[PDB]
Amino acid sequence: MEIDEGKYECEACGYIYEPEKGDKFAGIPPGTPFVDLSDSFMCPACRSPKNQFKSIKKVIAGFAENQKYG
Ligand SMILES: [Zn+2]
């Protein structure tokens, strides 16, 4: 829907790694971008290899628009 804060999504299970928040569930603190994870980080939900994670900085959403932007 709307992401960009270095939020990565596991294409293997659908988990979302939070960099600024850190993988508190895996052991990684916040203030850390996914690109800085360990050389072999595993998903805390599906245990997949960090290489299975993929960023997602895109915003898609639009169901109603009764206006013309000014
Ligand atoms: Zn996963």
User: What 3-state DSSP class applies to 10?
Assistant: strand
Q: What angle do CA 29, 41, 26 make, to 5 degrees?
A: 40
Q: 9 forms bridges with which residues in the sheet?
A: 16, 54
The total number of structural domains that make up the chain: 1
Contact of 5 with 55, CB cutoff 8 Å: no
**24 CA distance to ligand 1 middle (Å):** 15
Centroid of ligand 1 to alpha carbon of 66 (angstroms): 39
Whole-angstrom distance, CA of residue 27 vs CA of residue 42: 11
Whole-angstrom distance, CA of residue 23 vs CA of residue 16 = 10
CATH number at residue 68: 2.20.28.10
Range of the domain at 63: 1-70
Experimental approach was NMR
Q: Distance from the CA of 8 to the center of ligand 1, in angstroms?
A: 10
17 CA from centroid of ligand 1 (Å):
9
Angstrom CA distances, 15 to 7, 12, 18, 70, stand at 10, 8, 10, 38
